[PDB]
Amino acid sequence: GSSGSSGPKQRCRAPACDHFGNAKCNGYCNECFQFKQMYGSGPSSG
Numbered sequence: 001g002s003s004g005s006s007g008p009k010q011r012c013r014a015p016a017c018d019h020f021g022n023a024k025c026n027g028y029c030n031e032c033f034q035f036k037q038m039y040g041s042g043p044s045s046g
């Protein structure tokens, strides 16, 4: 945020992600979208 820089609002909806996102991925980028998933969603569980 240097002296208020210009730029389109077509970037990942994350504070630590300067990559191009996409509506499908809820705005976020594939990377973020995937990660978001609950780590450990295997088919089996006890």
Ligand SMILES: [Zn+2]
Pocket: 012, 013, 014, 017, 019, 028, 029, 030, 031, 032, 033
């Ligand atoms: Zn992202």
